[PDB]
Amino acid sequence: SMSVKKPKRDDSKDLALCSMILTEMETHEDAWPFLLPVNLKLVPGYKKVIKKPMDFSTIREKLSSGQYPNLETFALDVRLVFDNCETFNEDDSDIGRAGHNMRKYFEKKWTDTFK
């Protein structure tokens, strides 16, 4: 509360470490459904159904331009990518399985880096 603060957790490396995690996700062989925004002109249903589209290129641009206020807002956008994928794709599709694999991969890097 006012003039009463918990000790300062060092966040000075967070930007660099989120960038490293994002590089690792970008270079994973199963990243291909997630590298670019879904083409809203060419994929029926996507625009209406997926209220907040997100992809790795869009996170990379946000990261590079100071649009994440903290590491939690970064993780929210990453998870959004996989949440959208599960909303639109059957679990037993190539894209559906890619999304499960990538979410697993991300959550381990996240825990190992920050928890």
Curated annotation (Swiss-Prot):
Entry protein name: Bromodomain adjacent to zinc finger domain protein 2B
Family affiliation: Belongs to the WAL family.
Subunit description: Component of the BRF-1 ISWI chromatin remodeling complex, at least composed of SMARCA1 and BAZ2B, which regulates the spacing of histone octamers on the DNA template to facilitate access to DNA. Within the BRF-1 ISWI chromatin remodeling complex interacts with SMARCA1; the interaction is direct. Component of the BRF-5 ISWI chromatin remodeling complex, at least composed of SMARCA5/SNF2H and BAZ2B, which regulates the spacing of histone octamers on the DNA template to facilitate access to DNA.
Every Bromo domain range: 9-113
Tissue spec. comment: Expressed at varying levels in several tissues, whereas a smaller transcript was expressed specifically in testis.
Taxonomic classification: Eukaryota, Metazoa, Chordata, Craniata, Vertebrata
Subcellular location: Nucleus
Source domain of life: Eukaryota
Task of the protein: Regulatory subunit of the ATP-dependent BRF-1 and BRF-5 ISWI chromatin remodeling complexes, which form ordered nucleosome arrays on chromatin and facilitate access to DNA during DNA-templated processes such as DNA replication, transcription, and repair. Both complexes regulate the spacing of nucleosomes along the chromatin and have the ability to slide mononucleosomes to the center of a DNA template. The BRF-1 ISWI chromatin remodeling complex has a lower ATP hydrolysis rate than the BRF-5 ISWI chromatin remodeling complex.
